[PDB]
Amino acid sequence: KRYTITLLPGDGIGPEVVSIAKNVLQQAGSLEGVEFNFREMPIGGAALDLVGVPLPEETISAAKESDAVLLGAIGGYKWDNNEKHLRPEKGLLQIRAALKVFANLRPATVLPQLVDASTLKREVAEGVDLMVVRELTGGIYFGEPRGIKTNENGEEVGFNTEVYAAHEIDRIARVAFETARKRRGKLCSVDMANVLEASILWRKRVTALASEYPDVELSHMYVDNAAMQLVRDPKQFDTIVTNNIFGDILSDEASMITGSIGMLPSASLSDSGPGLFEPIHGSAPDIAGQDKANPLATILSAAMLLKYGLGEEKAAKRIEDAVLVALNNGFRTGDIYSAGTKLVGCKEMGEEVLKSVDS
Amino acid sequence: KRYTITLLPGDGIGPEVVSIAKNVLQQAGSLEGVEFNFREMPIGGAALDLVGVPLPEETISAAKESDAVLLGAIGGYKWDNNEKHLRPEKGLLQIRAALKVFANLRPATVLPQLVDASTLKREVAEGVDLMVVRELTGGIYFGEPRGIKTNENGEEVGFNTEVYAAHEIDRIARVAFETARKRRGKLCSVDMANVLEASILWRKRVTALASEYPDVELSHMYVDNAAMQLVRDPKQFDTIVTNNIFGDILSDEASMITGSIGMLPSASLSDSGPGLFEPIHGSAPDIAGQDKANPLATILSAAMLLKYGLGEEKAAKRIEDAVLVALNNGFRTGDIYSAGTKLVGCKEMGEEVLKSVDS
Ligand SMILES: [Mg+2]
Ligand SMILES: [Mg+2]
């Protein structure tokens, strides 16, 4: 009935779109007898300016002690020439690690009202609805050893290590099987098991877990083939599970295929703590304060918060329905504007979503 | 005026399409005062059946002593349950290493006659014409150390090493710069320099080579952004250079974006020896001997052989022009057939190309 939510407004358009999502979350939850206590905490450039680091401990503490975390965006010109460990992005890596949210869920859907935004033909883009479950805190991005060394003659050698232990594969796979159960019951595990030992172990562990989720249809696909299949017939996918680097690449491809980056939400889940919910778009510093931002991705991230974070299915559906009503009514922010629709600002789009909720 | 060409017919539709490309190469060459000595040598399943290994030494020798190598296809059901080092695919890895062809060139072009084959809208697909220059013999596919080990806890850990030495990056970059010079003078180097040390070194070496090719416009792009840009605006690319694993993924994405896999040729180039030229499609064992294969990719691979392998540009243009004429005249094999066109078999398509050359 009452949940604790940490808000991380962050940078650029972050505070603006989180403020709207906060209100939508309140109203939708209210209609299901659910109430929230919100606390805003610093992260990213906002934290750098206020505290001097991208992620203060107080923010980690508040996040960990809450039921779920809703983040806006991170990044800005001001901090782009900071040392690496003091860049806003570092705070995002750090809070994922601290919350142990190893599972990144990014749903790529093409909404009926926005089909023509995709560069894919209508009959190919219409009905696309897939979920990339990406291992988020491990693999080659974090693997050791790594470096640039000067070998025995004058010459530099640069190296990185793709590495996963069995338990890291198991836990991301389990989340993917559970996620397929909340969707259409089809899971495609994507790897390079024809050449990489790390992928051979990936496929071995996923294959072994299949018997524990016998209700889910499991298939396997190579990464380069998945990159082709997303272009040729993306409607074939329900849920995809893959490692960090392949998930990064394939999800971004899928996101672009839908055609509307400003619409796309994300969830980052752990085994037993609060999840982290965030739009995948950036901080869009050039339109900050100009009332142009698309709040719908953050609103849909609050819907994922309710569904995947708190198990509040009905409240989440209320949010998703109201977004569809706003789009059905012809309202579009600039990034999704098309002839014959109603171009609106961030605030007005937020207002239109709120009325369908409260209708 | 006389060149030595090694033919590697290989498996499935390989022999069929190489035999046609051989003749097209002969005729086009003839019209430019160029003649060829051809020798066929075993590789793949054909070598396995004949000699017992995927790549006999005699084939390496013949290839190395020739001016260029034209390969058909490799693979088949018969040998799929062979141990790894005796699979047909091993022979392809082995001949690339032996020939030291570290540069894989894959042109993704959407031909005007075949635009509707792409799942991308016509206005996006029309005019796509890019070249992926992929490092072919190094990186994580071949990197050490690698394996699946059992650690401390009795738990398996799987790992691989993405590694490049400076000289490996320099030589693939140089080929890419030289390739952009033969195209539109634009080179986009693709990496993950925001996170991988190996990519930091990649970007450092490519950036340093720019001053030696000041005529070429160099830009840099992250891999996940490139995967998006191929979907959103593939016409923006001329030449791309990238490492083995990223090149594999992005080229396959680009191939699918063109819509017609059976049309796509490839070249693998070395510093000073014979190149290896091959269609990117597989051996298609289900249509072998049925006169259904599309010979055009192999024919266009022979055009790359002339141009990139031997510097015979006019003869290469003769081949390319004849393919366009065949297509303009409405001829289509099954894989590129559309309503209103003339469905033909492999032989007849070959004949139409040959007619156009010899006129
Ligand atoms: Mg990305
Ligand atoms: Mg491939």
Q: What crossing angle do the helices spanning B313-328 and B296-304 adopt, rounded to 10°?
A: 160
**CA dihedral sign of residues B334, B337, B343, B345:** negative
The whole-angstrom distance between B330's CA and the closest CA on chain A is 24
> Strand B239-242 vs strand B129-135: parallel, antiparallel, or unpaired?
parallel
Residues A186 and A238 sit within 8 Å (Cβ to Cβ)? yes
What six digits make up the tokens of B278? Answer: 């091959």
Residues less than 5 Å from ion ligand 1, measured at CB: A 248, 252; B 224
Contact between residue A201 and residue A164 where contact means Cβ atoms under 8 Å apart: yes
Rounded to an integer, what distance in angstroms lies between the CA atom of residue A213 and that of residue A277? 26
Residues of B in contact with A159 (CB under 8 A): 143, 161-164, 197-198
How far, in Å, is the centroid of ligand 1 from the Cα of B303? Answer: 37
Chain B residue closest to A253 (CA)?
A: B228
Q: How many CB atoms lie within 10 A of CB B3?
A: 20
Q: Which helix (H) or strand (E) holds B45?
A: helix B45-50
The three-point CA angle B38-B42-B44 to 5° equals 135
Buried b (16+ CB within 10 A) or exposed e, B52-89: ebbbbeebbebbbebbbbbbbbbbbeebeeeeeeebbb
Q: Name the amino acid, one letter, at B45.
A: G
- Cα-trace Rg, chain A: 20
Q: Of A147, A162, A248, which has the smallest distance from its Cβ to B160's Cβ?
A: A162
Which tokens hold the place of A249? 């690449």
The CATH number assigned to the domain holding A109 equals 3.40.718.10
A260-263 long-range Cβ contacts below 8 angstroms, 24+ apart? A260/A111, A260/A114, A260/A117, A260/A118, A260/A335, A260/A336, A261/A335, A262/A294, A262/A296, A262/A297, A262/A333, A262/A335, A262/A336, A263/A111, A263/A114, A263/A294, A263/A296, A263/A297, A263/A300, A263/A336
Chain A residues in contact with B161 by the CB 8 A cut-off are 159-162
The sign one gets for the Cα dihedral A231, B140, B108, B28 is negative
Give chain B positions within 8 Å (CB) of A104: none
Ion ligand 2 residue ranges (Cβ < 5 Å): A 224; B 248, 252
- Domain range for residue B135? 1-359
The answer to the question of whether B290 is labelled as a binding residue is yes
Total structural domains in chain B? 1
A234 backbone φψ class: left, alpha, beta (φ>0; ψ -120 to 50): alpha
Distance between Cα B126 and ligand 2 center (Å)? 24
Q: Report CB contact under 8 Å: B228, A255.
A: yes
Size of interface A-B (CB pairs under 8 A): 158
Q: Which two tokens stand for residue A228?
A: 């082709």
Among A119, A167, A229, select the one facing B120 at the smallest CB separation. Answer: A119
Using alpha carbons, select from B175, B187, B21, B190 the residue that is nearest to residue B102: B175
Secondary structure letter of residue B153 according to DSSP: T
Provide, as residue numbers in chain B, all residues whose Cβ is less than 8 Å from the Cβ of A257.
231
B283 is in an annotated binding site: yes
What value, to the nearest 5°, has the Cα angle with vertex A67 and ends A285 and A164?
A: 75
Chain A contact set for B119 (CB, 8 A): 120-121, 124, 231-233
In this structure, what DSSP letter does residue A77 have?
G
Q: What angle do CA B121, B124, B126 make, to 5 degrees?
A: 95
User: H or E element: which one contains B200?
Assistant: helix B197-209
How many CB atoms sit inside 10 A of residue B311's CB? 9
